[PDB]
Amino acid sequence: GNPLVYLDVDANGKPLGRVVLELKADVVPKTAENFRALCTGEKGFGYKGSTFHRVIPSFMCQAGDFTNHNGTGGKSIYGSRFPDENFTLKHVGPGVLSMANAGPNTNGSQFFICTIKTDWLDGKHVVFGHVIEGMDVVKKIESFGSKSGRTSKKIVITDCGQLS
């Protein structure tokens, strides 16, 4: 079936716990595969050790810039960027996992976890999974954000990988 992956997250070195994500490989196989491989690090790069660099309460928690740590970087397993696969899945509510981008067809490695329904992103960001377990951890991360997106604690993905 669809992959299950995990992110173990610290804030200022204190473990927050684990976020488990189901990747909708049945709907968006290319987008799911990129994220899966970046979690395992099997291509020689990925999310381990990188940060949630932009977190906005009552919106979303963004991560995945493992090259520049600031929203400008990241790369996919395919090349620097890859196309929007489809917009079939919608930003239905808290726990949605979706690709960050810089406009059409600019997916790399950056992603966000929604903490509300974000319907205005439908048709603009590729949704590719959802939180299975660990919304408590997501709420903790969210609580360390701000209106500007600046985090008030350093939020690090210490470990990540594939469960099934």
Ligand SMILES: NS(=O)(=O)c1ccc(C(=O)O)cc1
């Ligand atoms: N003192 S700290 O390392 O900045 C800190 C405090 C609380 C929490 C939490 O609520 O989980 C995480 C980190």
Ligand SMILES: NS(=O)(=O)c1ccc(C(=O)O)cc1
């Ligand atoms: N809670 S909300 O009014 O839907 C919202 C959405 C986005 C942002 C932001 O980009 O900063 C802030 C608030």
